[PDB]
Amino acid sequence: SHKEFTKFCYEVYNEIKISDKEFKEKRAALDTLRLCLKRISPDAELVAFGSLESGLALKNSDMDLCVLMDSRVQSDTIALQFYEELIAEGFEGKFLQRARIPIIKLTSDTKNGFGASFQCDIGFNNRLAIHNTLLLSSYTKLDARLKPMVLLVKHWAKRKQINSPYFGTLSSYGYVLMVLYYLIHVIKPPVFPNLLLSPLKQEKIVDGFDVGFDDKLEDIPPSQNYSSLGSLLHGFFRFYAYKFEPREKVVTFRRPDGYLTKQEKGWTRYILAIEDPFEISNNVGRTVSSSGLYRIRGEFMAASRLLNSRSYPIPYDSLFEEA
């Protein structure tokens, strides 16, 4: 079956998804921050990426922003200018620089009324993030099942304490890639084609990486997989519990059969290996510690055992229970 679980998944889905109210306020916040960027640099543009842009936003979602500008004009200079205007226009935060990369983190708003805990990361010419977002965006437009499946997984990972990059587990982005990897290269029939391996894929080099994928979405045949949201979620939890091999294998979008060893890629941290689609040198699972992996796997198994329990009624609610 999975009929009751599907029903339940849709019920939690509507409680966790960003409302139209929060969405509209986040979009007003952006209008504001753009006015501040105009007063500093007329030519620079401010773009959003991440969950809000792709449509994979939970409630209480942080904003991920990037400033695009002429690469020849140096980004440490106008970053600071932007920071000072944000401060002056009533924003609180930090101005930072890891290596050569400048970052502003806005932590609060004291005047324009976007919250006492308004959280917002601003980068400068982080072009790859935009592209990563385009990819996730396109997939979301391709199948109506993706979006609810992702937010459920994110909610799950957050609830199970397995969604902390700084504490030895995996980022949200990392979980989205695992979802996509499952939907493309594991489930049969596949729910999604691999857009990066499309015959129609035009090459586009950005910052040294090929960010090309097939974006003419309308021309793509709909999925010949007809599984319910529940079925898919069960398949997902089953695959990473029992089938997938973290020690030998890499989650990839560069192989037509999704088959990649850690060794081919030279990834002997690499406890969990997820190859970023475009920034292929970047391992998204790099934050996953040894004990982090144990917990991540333990949760994948428990989730499978639950969904497969014979003790009726199945306490589906325990799929989302704190720690």
Ligand X SMILES: Nc1ncnc2c1ncn2[C@@H]1O[C@H](COP(=O)(O)OP(=O)(O)OP(=O)(O)O)[C@@H](O)[C@H]1O
54 touches 140 (CB < 8 A): yes
- The pairing of beta strand 120-124 with beta strand 101-109: antiparallel
Q: Applying CB under 6 A, which of residues 64, 109, 214, 275 lies at the interface with ligand X?
A: 64
124 counts as binding ligand X under rule CB under 6 A: no
Q: Does 169 bind ligand X (CB under 6 A)?
A: no
Interaction of residue 62 with Mg ion, rule CB under 5 A? yes
* 29 is an interface residue for ligand X by CB under 6 A: no
* Residue 284 within binding range of ligand X, rule CB under 6 A: yes
* CB-CB neighbours of 186 under 10 Å: 17
Q: Quick one: which of 19, 282, 308, 309 contacts ligand X (CB under 6 A)?
A: 282
**Segment interacting with ligand X (CB under 6 A) among 19-27, 44-52, 99-107, 243-251:** 44-52
Q: Does residue number 53 form part of the binding site for Mg ion (CB under 5 A)?
A: no
Residues whose CB is less than 8 angstroms from the CB of residue 148 and which lie 6 or more positions away in sequence, other chains included: 9, 10, 13, 17, 229
Distance of CA 138 to the CA centre of its chain: 13
Residue 188: count of CB within 10 angstroms of its CB: 9
Query: Do the beta carbons of residue 233 and residue 5 sit within 8 Å?
Result: yes
What is the rounded CA–CA span in Å between residue 223 and residue 51?
Answer: 23
According to the binding rule CB under 5 A, does residue 50 interact with Mg ion?
yes
The tokens for 69 are 């500008």
68-76, 167-175, 183-191, 215-223 -> range binding ligand X (CB under 6 A): 167-175
C-beta closer to Mg ion: residue 177 or 306: 177
Give contact residues for ligand X (rule: CB under 6 A). Answer: 49-51, 58, 61-62, 64, 129, 132-133, 171-174, 276, 282, 284
Where do contacts with Mg ion occur on this chain (CB under 5 A)?
50, 62, 64
